[PDB]
Design a protein around this nucleic acid. Structure first.
Lengths: 141, 63, 101, 206, 69, 145, 143
RNA sequence: UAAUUGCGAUAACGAACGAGACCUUAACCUACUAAAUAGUGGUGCUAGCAUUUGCUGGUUAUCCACUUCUUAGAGGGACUAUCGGUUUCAAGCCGAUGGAAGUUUGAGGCAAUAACAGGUCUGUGAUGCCCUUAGACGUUCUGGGCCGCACGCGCGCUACACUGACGGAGCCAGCGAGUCUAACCUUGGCCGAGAGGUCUUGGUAAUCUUGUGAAACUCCGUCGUGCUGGGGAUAGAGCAUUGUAAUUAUUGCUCUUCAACGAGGAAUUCCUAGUAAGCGCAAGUCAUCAGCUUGCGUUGAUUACGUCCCUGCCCUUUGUACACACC
């Protein structure tokens, strides 16, 4: 009854939680369709997990993604995480493990961090400078 | 334009005062036996192809 | 019976966790619904003096941290057993307040 | 191509040109090859990318930046001179207009124009400085294939930046006409003039 | 410097020269002809309602066009 | 699709408020050469005089050019708010005046002479040629000219 | 098969709804429409002086639909921007509160939003109606 | 080797401090411990479309279930694991795969022996000696000064514009702070162009301010190479706030005034990956004032993977007429 898998995707502050349940195939982000994700130039980034493995895989699954935190570019990289993670976790649980496998191989061969979060984190600022490494200008005389 | 191609077969080491010049021995890509040793500016790997204006200088170690 | 709340604020985790364990230990030896320990996010109080007396030297900066740990448990109990649970759990470093309603 | 009807609208112009072969915005990554030897496998346009925006780590290793697509390397050199630092969204928009303009004048693939412009602009003999004592002599040396790509992207973006600074033409149009003029040996571009001046200096210094 | 108003000797300079241009834009109209830029954005819509040039990209900061035929 | 084919009534450099107003620029920023009005005042007087803002100053013939200038002398009787005025309850009369092209120097000189002959601190600083507001002059303010 | 404002883009819907408010007729716009800079951090009055208020009303009505409820202070922070205070660095400055209050009072009078419990203004019964009407034909605008 | 870090060789053997270890913080956990002060799904009530069973919502606890997301307890995980290649065959180094993580995983905290006539007597009811101690060098109150400007120097902020300015539209965070005998953070309603005023409310705080709806950014339009609509210095008039008091403009807002500056000589600073740089936000000081500082997040690169050439540092050898030690 109502086979659903929840997942999450992270980019540098953001968290996009995606619910992948069985249905007709609507992919809505924050209540808006996937065509309405409007930084307007990263529109294919939210499309890359959709169209790397074919649109026919989404003919029966409903995906709802809600984002929080991060920025305008960081949120986009968090949705495409949760789309790929939501697709591969759904196929791990509810259909054949053979089907789960090439999805992971298709995402790995085009690894744009679809499945794995990058561990890059902001270094803390120290005193004596305006940044983590940069230092205040000295005059010597 | 007698542009001659060559490929690095062995990276000897860095040269120059600041160590920004790398000395390499290059195989001539057109005949087997002749190999000349020259010096490059940027980063070179093993078996990467080079371009020489003239293969006559036989560059020595920079100061 | 009456619905009460035990809130514990502390600076020492070791002097807080086993007391919250002791608070809940006197709570399931006889049976009643727990609504047990919910740990609030820790509060870090930061003070940044420089390092020094009068400002000679390199501009070195410090950071002094005080860590606050908070928990609350929402229990319901008759009045005669609400009394001796907040008298036996007396221990250093942690304050205990009980909300009547 | 058997389109799939779906609850999501996902309009027809999106998936018709990508599901068989994944493209650029709308541009083919096939039939483009580095015509000039020693700039193979340092100029990387093998795997296609939809847009030139990747949050990839290329500075963690010595030679890992060569695996970055050169379209994204061109956008990285576009965001320069302080006020444009960290504005990759603008740089992608600049390069999206630029590839469209390049096709308008010359009807071939703009990716192919960019690739051969990189090869034509790379200096092939540079000059180092040998200090010693006094005169600070100059010595002509060779140049790495990686540095040829590094200087080509640097010279093409700088000349595009300088031409569009106090001018009514946009940066995208100046970048396009620089790459067009640098595709051939026209010597009307800043990058070809700088490469020729650098080579004739090294010719005198050898 | 640059004209800001048409005077019947700059209207006609559009119809038999812009269809001889494979690339027209705001900067193109002010470079080959001497127009004041504001009219260049107006003229690109004038040659849009009637078929002279066709769009292949639309953007507020860059307008790229090609000939209709 | 909004070109006109006007050729005769277009005018070159023209004189309003005894000041040279540039002809081939937009009217809102054409009026800004009058010392006493700015960009936001010229925007208001063009809307109050029923002037299309897109037209160049080479257009706009005589009769609503008179409308523009009549608005400029007398703003109060044309529902222009008092806080938009240049001088409100100014120094002597208590009424609201918007100082215009040639009167800006006169009203400023009258203001400067008034607080000079009163021997206030501002007037003596103005007479000395120093900075009149509370700003440091140990480092900045060089090259007085 | 049933569409909402969330299924249509933000920019074209606001343009269509402001144009719908243009041809509708009654919004009792204030008398200071062409006088006010709309922000204490701005520089110029709005360039489209005939329809900036209707665009503000369409944007406010869309914002109320997507959210639970908003106040004037939330609208002031949302529509505000960075102020160029000159030689000093920029900082965030809230927008004008009188225009946002007059927009909300104009919307209440024509009956698209109502006053709400726990503060703020929620959208009305007809507010979901006329929003979803304008959300409807915006999808079929392509002939 | 980052390391007097180790393999080793050895008139040395066995030790101690420093380093490392350690502690804090950021990364991974569908594994446990359960959360109406964090969420999620269904269930009730109810709205809009479609009507076909659907989508987008609202509903302070209507109820039920769970902990993926959030929190914090105990833990696990990396030790360079596996493979390949190099060396005296060792300490190690390099390449590839796997992994959340392979530079000591990133960053800090802590940090030797010896020393400086380094700074601080203006932090101290820390203090010796000298001075003063009633017309006082004590203390208090009224004004003023610390800010005064022919000029020189150091840290910075804003710019010299089209990768831009301006006007609408989208709307995206993290670190934190906040009032019982006192007026702290302030939601919401009303008035006002704005600054701001007024009536209430929530919060001693994962509860409310606050999703701090930040800014750069993104569309659409105006501008059109013009010191121009870049820049807002300087100056005039008025309206408000804090304060016993605003003049020597405290500061905020409105109108006007519209300077230099067209990428900066000799010199010179900082920086190797979520780094520089761009951008704003919280806190300190606060009654009022942030162009400063301490932190935080947003966007996010080019170039190196080296050398001792300049400036310095560690060890060995070597010369010395130096030991206040090449000033």
């Amino acid at each position: 009854a109502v086979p659903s898998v929840q997942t999450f995707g992270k980019k540098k502050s953001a968290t996009a939680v995606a619910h992948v349940k069985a249905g007709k195939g609507l992919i809505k982000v924050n209540g808006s369709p996937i065509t309405l994700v409007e930084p307007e130039i990263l529109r294919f980034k939210v499309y890359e997990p959709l169209l790397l493995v074919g649109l026919d895989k989404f003919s029966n699954i409903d995906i709802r993604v809600r984002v929080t935190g991060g920025g305008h570019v960081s949120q986009v990289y968090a949705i495409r995480q949760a789309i790929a993670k939501g697709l591969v976790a759904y196929h791990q649980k509810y259909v054949d493990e053979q089907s789960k496998n090439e999805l992971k191989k298709a995402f790995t061969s085009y690894d744009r961090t679809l499945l794995i979060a990058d561990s890059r984190r902001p270094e803390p600022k120290k005193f004596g400078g305006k940044g983590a490494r940069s230092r205040f200008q000295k005059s010597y005389r | 334009t007698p542009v001659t191609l060559a490929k690095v077969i062995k990276v000897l080491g860095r040269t120059g005062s600041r160590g920004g010049v790398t000395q390499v021995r290059v195989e001539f890509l057109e005949d087997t036996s002749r190999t000349i040793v020259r010096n490059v500016k940027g980063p070179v790997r093993e078996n990467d192809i080079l371009v020489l204006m003239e293969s006559e200088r036989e560059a020595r170690r920079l100061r | 019976i009456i619905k009460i709340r035990i809130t514990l604020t502390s600076t020492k985790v070791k002097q807080l966790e086993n007391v919250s364990s002791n608070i809940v230990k006197n709570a399931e030896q006889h049976n009643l619904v727990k609504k047990g320990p919910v740990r609030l996010p820790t509060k870090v109080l930061k003070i940044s003096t420089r390092k020094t007396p009068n400002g000679e030297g390199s501009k070195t900066w410090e950071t002094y941290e005080m860590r606050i740990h908070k928990r609350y448990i929402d229990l319901e109990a008759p009045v005669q057993i609400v009394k001796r649970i907040t008298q036996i759990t007396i221990e250093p470093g942690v304050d205990v307040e009980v909300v009547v309603a | 191509f058997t389109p799939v009807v779906l609850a999501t609208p996902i309009p027809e112009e999106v998936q018709q040109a990508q599901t068989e072969i994944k493209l650029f915005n709308k541009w083919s990554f096939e039939e483009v090859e580095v015509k000039d030897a020693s700039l193979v496998d340092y100029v990387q346009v093998r795997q296609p990318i939809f847009v030139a925006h990747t949050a990839g780590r290329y500075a963690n290793k010595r030679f890992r930046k060569a695996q970055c697509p050169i379209i994204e390397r061109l956008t990285n050199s576009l965001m320069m001179n302080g006020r444009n630092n960290g504005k990759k969204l603008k740089a992608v928009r600049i390069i999206k207009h630029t590839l469209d303009i390049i096709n308008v004048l010359t009807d071939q693939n703009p990716i192919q124009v960019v690739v051969d412009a990189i090869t034509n602009t790379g200096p092939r003999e540079d000059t180092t400085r040998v200090g010693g004592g006094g005169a600070a002599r100059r010595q002509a040396v060779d140049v790495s294939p990686l540095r040829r790509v590094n200087q080509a992207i640097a010279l093409l973006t700088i000349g595009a930046r300088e031409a569009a600074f106090r001018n009514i033409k946009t940066i995208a149009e100046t970048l396009a006409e620089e790459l067009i003029n640098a595709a051939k040996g026209s010597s009307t571009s800043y990058a070809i003039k700088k490469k020729d001046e650098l080579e004739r200096v090294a010719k005198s210094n050898r | 410097q640059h004209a800001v108003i048409l005077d019947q000797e700059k209207y006609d300079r559009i119809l038999k020269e812009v269809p001889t241009y494979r690339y027209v834009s705001v900067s193109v109209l002010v470079d080959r002809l001497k127009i004041g830029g504001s009219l260049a954005r107006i003229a690109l819509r004038h040659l849009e309602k009637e078929g002279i040039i066709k769009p292949i990209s639309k953007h507020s900061k860059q307008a790229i066009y090609t000939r209709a035929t | 699709s909004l070109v006109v084919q006007e050729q005769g009534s277009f005018q070159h450099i023209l004189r309003l408020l005894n000041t040279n107003v540039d002809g081939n620029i937009k009217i809102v920023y054409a009026l800004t050469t009058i010392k006493g009005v700015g960009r936001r005042y010229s925007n208001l007087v063009c809307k109050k005089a029923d002037v299309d803002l897109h037209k160049r100053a080479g257009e706009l013939t005589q009769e609503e050019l008179e409308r523009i200038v009549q608005i400029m002398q007398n703003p109060t009787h044309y529902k222009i708010p008092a806080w938009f005025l240049n001088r409100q309850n100014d120094i002597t009369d208590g009424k609201d005046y918007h100082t215009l092209a040639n009167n800006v120097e006169s009203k400023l000189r009258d203001d400067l002479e008034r607080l000079k002959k009163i021997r206030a601190h501002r007037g003596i600083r103005h007479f000395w040629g120093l900075r009149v507001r509370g700003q440091h002059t140990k480092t900045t303010g060089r090259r007085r000219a | 098969p049933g569409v909402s404002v969330r299924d249509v883009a933000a920019q074209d819907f606001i343009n269509a709804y402001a144009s719908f408010l243009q041809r509708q007729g009654k919004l009792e716009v204030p008398g200071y429409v062409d006088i006010v800079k709309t922000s204490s951090g701005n520089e110029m009055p709005p360039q489209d002086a005939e329809g900036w208020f209707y665009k503000r009303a369409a944007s406010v009505a869309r914002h109320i639909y997507m959210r639970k409820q908003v106040g004037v202070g939330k609208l002031n922070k949302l529509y505000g921007g960075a102020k160029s205070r000159g030689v000093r660095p920029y900082k965030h400055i809230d927008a004008s509160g009188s225009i946002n209050r007059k927009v909300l009072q104009a919307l209440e009078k024509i009956g698209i939003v109502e006053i709400s419990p726990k503060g703020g203004r929620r959208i009305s019964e007809n507010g979901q109606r006329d929003l979803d009407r304008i959300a409807a034909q915006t999808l079929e605008e392509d002939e």
